[PDB]
């Protein structure tokens, strides 16, 4: 069934939770279309992936646990 989100990650970067939900949903929809239905479709979710990933990276850098440059 559905695999829940990470509580520690959400607690560390709550401002990224909605972006994560949107990315996970996009990816699941894409995977269903291509690998469950076997339909040759465009790659998807690059934008949703970027939004979430950048949000997480920004949080790590802001808290001083990831270098900026
Ligand atoms: Co499952």
Author numbering: -2 to 66
Sentences from the paper on this structure:
Mdm35, another conserved yeast IMS protein, is a binding partner of Ups proteins, and facilitate their import into mitochondria. Surprisingly, two distinct polypeptides of Ups1 and Mdm35 form a single compact domain, the Ups1 part of which corresponds to the START (StAR-related lipid-transfer) domain, likely functioning as a lipid-binding domain.
The crystal structure of Mdm35ΔC5 was thus determined from its seleno-methionine (SeMet)-labelled protein crystal by the multiwavelength anomalous dispersion method using the anomalous signal of selenium atoms and was subsequently refined to 1.45-Å resolution against the data set from the native crystal. Mdm35 possesses a twin CX9C motif, which is indicative of the substrate for the Tim40/MIA import pathway. Mdm35 contains a short α-helix (α0) and two long α-helices (α1 and α2), which form an antiparallel α-hairpin that is covalently paired by two disulfide bridges, Cys13–Cys52 and Cys23–Cys42.
